[PDB]
Amino acid sequence: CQDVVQDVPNVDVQMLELYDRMSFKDIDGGVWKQGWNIKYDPLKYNAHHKLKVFVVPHSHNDPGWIQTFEEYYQHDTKHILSNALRHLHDNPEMKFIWAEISYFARFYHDLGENKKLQMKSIVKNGQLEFVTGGWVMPDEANSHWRNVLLQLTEGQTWLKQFMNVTPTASWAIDPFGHSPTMPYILQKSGFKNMLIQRTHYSVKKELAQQRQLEFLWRQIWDNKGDTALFTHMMPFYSYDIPHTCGPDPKVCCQFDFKRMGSFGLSCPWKVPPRTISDQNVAARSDLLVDQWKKKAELYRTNVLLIPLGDDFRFKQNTEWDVQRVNYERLFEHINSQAHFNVQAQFGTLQEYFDAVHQAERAGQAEFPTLSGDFFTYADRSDNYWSGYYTSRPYHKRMDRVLMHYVRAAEMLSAWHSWDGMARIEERLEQARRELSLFQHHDGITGTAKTHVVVDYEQRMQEALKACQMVMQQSVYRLLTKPSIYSPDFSFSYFTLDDSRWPGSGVEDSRTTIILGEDILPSKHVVMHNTLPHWREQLVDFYVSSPFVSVTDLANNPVEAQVSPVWSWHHDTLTKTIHPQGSTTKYRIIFKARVPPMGLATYVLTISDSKPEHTSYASNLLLRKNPTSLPLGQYPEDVKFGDPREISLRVGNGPTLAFSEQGLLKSIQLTQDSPHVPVHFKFLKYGVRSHGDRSGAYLFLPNGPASPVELGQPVVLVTKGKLESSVSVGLPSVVHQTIMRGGAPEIRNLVDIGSLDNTEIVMRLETHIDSGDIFYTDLNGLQFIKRRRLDKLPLQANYYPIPSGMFIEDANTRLTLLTGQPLGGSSLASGELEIMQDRRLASDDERGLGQGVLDNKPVLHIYRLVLEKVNNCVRPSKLHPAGYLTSAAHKASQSLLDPLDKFIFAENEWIGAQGQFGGDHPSAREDLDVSVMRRLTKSSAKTQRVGYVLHRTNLMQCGTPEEHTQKLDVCHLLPNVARCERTTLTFLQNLEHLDGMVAPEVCPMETAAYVSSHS
Ligand SMILES: [O-]S([O-])([O-])O[C@@H](CO)[C@H](O)C[S@+]1C[C@@H](O)[C@H](O)[C@H]1CO
Ligand SMILES: *[C@@H]1O[C@H](CO)[C@@H](O)[C@H](O)[C@H]1NC(C)=O
Ligand SMILES: [Zn+2]
Known part of the structure; x- marks a missing residue:
């Protein structure tokens, strides 16, 4: 096993180091507003070295955003897919790529058999190519890795069954910033290449200048490079046609043939496209080839990718014709004019990557290595997309609840084979698909219209009911004597x-x-x-x-x-x-x-x-002007007192002290130790009165947060032998600290009410000498080192907190684990903060067309772990990762599962x-069975069960190891006949395992195994 702690990987580009060196100046670059005037040598391409150009038609189809999934399907997507089938069938040279399998499966199942066969033929022949093949194109900031894998598996399993294909190239043109958890999962799922687009404009400029937009993206702790996945970052401001042909959108817009007028679209640069004719094709080609050769200067091979698409494009038959015929006139001219030294054609994404790698193997290019992430994204000026790390927090929390319910339902029902009448597979497929849909980058992100958010919520509620049904039927079967078990599959x-x-x-x-x-x-x-x-x-x-x-x-x-x-x-x-x-x-x-x-x-x-x-x-209500609180038969009478500081200790756990306002002020780990200052405080951010306004996507605060005025809040103290707590009713938040003997649990019932243009933040103030360093997780999978940069505005220093964050110095660490993804930061040494909710009256100009005024009460949950870390073996100062302790990891598991x-x-x-x-074996604490799923219905003679095993990496701090048994998932069910290691989606067998034994995995690794049973 590779050591993930002590060896700092040597990479060409490490994003934290790059961020420390970059100036992020927003200067006007000319027509490429966020770049520079690209120059190229006309003599670079010649008869023996041509520029190969692949124009890749595409249509970005959001599974809910401004309309629901079903509304878009009926109004747009079913027409796009029907016309793509007809046009590709009739024009053999035309190509098209498709990413969102939720829509494709919705369409394909409604097709008659003749058309299903036509569709299979255009996929088998390479005209229509699936890219990524997930149910959706997921958010990468708030999503848990387990759900990113769930949705990938849902789409790819459908593709393998109905289309007989498994994509090996990924296309992610719209998530708002990008996470290394994607290449981690994709490389373990058979992928060879991936493409990304929304990265900070300053990063695109920097990497473009060094021709580092294509790179081998490895994990931050990977010294050897076995996790590496070839990645292509697009260079420009958008994936639309004006920003994909080259650096000058005023020119590229003239090559979007849907913008001449009859379609209701136009070019904002004020020069329209013109139909290609024999009289203008030479001048139009001169302009287009010049844009292509400028774009090619930013990359290392002679193979150029030119995406051709936008949101819900290729809908009308007339649109297919106007784009195809005009581009074909351009190709025929360009490819016959030797002086351009260009060969251009329609292509697919995989065709582009295959040609790039052919060039690499011929020794014509070598690519840099890179580690790090691409958060926080800004598309222009100071407009950082850190608002969506919190927007619609009720549904962000619901995501994590359903994540666990889907895992528990699949695991509980996997132990047995079920008759079809029990409807187990039916309910689990519904739950998986609704949770998968919500991974969309307008779902969990909180960036959809109100009625679309309601649709996602209703779908997830149905999914929770489906999981409950499956779980309770499974419990009844697992715990009832078999000869007595008498199920009614509809009964609770x-x-x-x-x-x-x-x-x-x-x-x-x-x-x-x-x-x-x-x-x-x-x-x-x-x-x-x-x-x-x-x-x-x-x-x-x-x-x-x-x-x-x-x-x-x-x-x-x-x-x-x-x-x-x-x-x-x-x-x-x-x-x-x-x-x-x-x-x-x-x-x-x-x-x-x-x-x-x-x-x-x-x-x-x-x-x-x-x-x-x-x-x-016992119960104590601290407030001035109390009134009685009868509790019926409860045997201890409630006590009253004026507000005062209080201290509590459950078991041999820590002693916590609270202010008279009911907020933590210190933690004392043991009888003798110091009372370490740790104080909770609630504050509010506002919105700018001039300039750009915060909205669902953007966080544009009007300066540092101001404390919430607390008044003299009512504080309730409950003291028990097993559990004690302090709860206080603050404006917009009932804040509760619960003690059971270890690290406390924090619960906030957050109701922002009618407080317009307000974001409520929970801050922890300590005296830990963290400086400008803090750590946040990526998708619940890994912790990455962050450095607060005072050269960037406050909102750029906010990062996603999908499951936890921490600060530390040489001796002390404070970790906050979360039961829901929210945005947060460390804006000063010794502080942590995490946003609770935000209510915004204005739209932020990214297309949503509304503010965020649909807030509802949500219960946020956390665990707060203060620990001594002077004895822990931690990475060196230059390592880009951090790792949790055993107690912090167990606390995160207590929240999520x-x-x-x-x-x-x-x-x-x-x-x-x-x-x-x-x-059942009790496995070492760092190992989890992330997924247990039976893969066969009851009619299969050979049953198959899939397992995803993940080992995290916990710090060594001096606690003796002890016990634990080896976990071999292949022997959890009886009568095992075969054990195979597979890709994480279970779709390809990678290794036949000796003795039918599934080995455990190394720290930070994830493997999948399928056991077969006779
Ligand atoms: O034209 S729009 O719809 O207003 O906005 C665009 C180009 O202008 C975007 O590329 C549409 S993307 C589609 C949707 O998934 C994202 O929320 C949006 C964030 O802006
Ligand atoms: C599925 O594709 C493979 C090649 O990838 C082909 O050999 C096979 O015949 C196709 N259909 C089947 C048998 O599933
Ligand atoms: Zn989108």
Whole structure:
């Protein structure tokens, strides 16, 4: 295994180092506004060395943006695909590339058999070529790598089954900045090449000057280069025709033949295209070839890529004709005029890359190596696209909830083969496709119109219901004696209980377990643990009495804590935000211990008085002018006091101190240690009153944030043996710090209300001497070093926080893990900050045509880990990566993949068993079974199950290793007949494994395996 910590890779271009050296000046470059006047030597190409030009027709089809997926399909995409089929069928030399398989599958399934056969023929013959082949072209900033892989697999599995092709070239022309997680996944999925477009204009200028727009993109920790993927970065401001033929858009616009008038389009540079004729073709070719030769100067081979397309293009038959015929007249002239020394033709993306590599193998070019990312993007001036790291945060959080539900449903149902009548494959395909759709770069990014966001939300709600159905049917089968198991596949044997989604204060969605002497004495509950190691976690349920005790199925008592159910209300009469307690529902909390990838059953029983093994939390309301808070049968009366500082400690965990406003002020790790200053603060950013306005995409603050005025907020303190917490009702946020014995959990119920042109940020202030360095993750896969640059504006220093961020000095680190992707930064030494929500009245001029005024309450979740790191073996000062500690990684897993909780719905569960998975190996803590998916339906004689195994890399800080068993996923199911290592999409077998054993993977590596069973 390569060492991912101690060896700094030697690359030609390292983006953090490049950023430190670049000046980012926004100077007027002439017709190429963000470049320079390109010069070329006419003698470079000649009879023996021609410029080969591939014009690649394309149509960018967003799966929802300004219209829903179905609206665009009916109004635009079905016509584009129908006319592409007709035009390509009738014109053998014409080509076209297609990226979004969600639309292609929606079209293909509605085609009659004759047309399906025609479509297969134009794909098999190379006229229509799929690029990437994912369900969507995903966002790369907020998306979790697991979902990037899910959507890639959904599209490529469809293509392999119906079109018999698997793309090896990727096309990503629209995500708003680019992540190295893409080449990581693509290279492990059989890809050989990829293309990107939206990178900072200063980066395009810098790389173009050095002819470094094509590079071998490797991961930041990869010393050897085995992760490298050839990448082509486009050079110009857009993927539209005016910015793809060459440097001067006023010229290139004249070669978009859809802009002459009858189509409702024109050239903003005020010179229109003119139909090519024998009388103007020589002058028109002179102009076009000059643009091509200038673009070719920015690259190293004699093969040039000229994309020809835009949003929802190639819709009308007349458009296909006007583009094709005019370009064919130009090719016939150009290719017959020896003085140009050019051979131009329509081509596909793969044809371009194959020709580039032929040139490379002939020794005509060598390419530079590069590591790093391409965030934060700016397309012009100071317009940095860091707003979408937070926009529509409710749906960003929903993404992570559904991510976990899809994994748990696929894993729980994989253990058995299911009859078709159970509809398991049907529900899982629906859930995978809705979650995959939301990965679109106008989905999770929060950049779609309001009614489109509603459509994505409704699709994800249906997907969550599908996952619940599959999970509860699977639990009933896994934990019932087989000769008693009697399923009705439409029945709800269990209901899921989720304490953090939608969340208290967001939706009253949780069911209360109703117990009573005259109705039902007890109730079975079951926890599922999707992670491959034994895990304990506190779990809570609502119950109708405070006198409840817990037992396991061997009837052993389990220690439990009962607390009240508190709900916060913005009281419009008293004008205060304060909590109300229930006098008939209570929370019972206990530690569940669950096997690796397994299940554990417990029983909740009512008694007429306080049970021996259940304790009750005390509650203290700190506020001036208190009023009583009765809690029914709850045995401890609520206490009151004026606001004051308070300190709490659960178990042997840290001691946390809080200000009189209910906000953390310090953390003391052990009995003797210092109370380390760590303070939470909420602030607000505004919008500029002149100049460019923030919107869904852009963050354009009117200066540093201002503190939210807190008034004298009401603070609720709950102190229990198993769980304690401090909650405070602040303007727009009920902020809660929860302690269970380790790093605290933070929950914010964020309701920005009607505060227009406001972005609410949560900041942590410490005295850690971090300087200008901080770390943020990329897609939940890796942590990258960031350097705050005071030569760039505030919004350029914001980065995506898809799952966590940290600051550190020689001795101390503070890590904030998140349960949802949000934007954040470290704007000063010792600080971390993360945006909670943003409400913006204005459109930001990127085509959305609206502000962001559809905010709704969202419950954000976090874990806050303060640690000593002076003993940790960390990368050297020049290494571009960082790595979590064991505690921080476990805290992130507690947010993203918590235990699932199931409540038995009927009165009696006949044949119930106490546990499933007790014999499953408990793997080392850095290893995860990211995906477990049965790949065959029940009629297949040879069943196949796919696994994606990922090992992260955790710092070595002095804790002895201990235990753990080797995990061989190929032997998790019985009767294994074969084990194969495959691409990550499961579509190609790469290695037949000796002894049917699937080896574990190295740190930072991900592998896929398929076991076959007879
Ligand atoms: O013409 S528009 O639609 O206003 O904007 C463009 C060219 O002007 C963009 O390239 C359309 S892209 C399409 C959509 O996926 C992105 O949200 C948009 C960000 O701007
Ligand atoms: C699928 O494509 C392969 C080549 O990639 C070809 O040999 C095969 O016949 C095609 N159809 C089948 C058999 O699946
Ligand atoms: Zn797009």
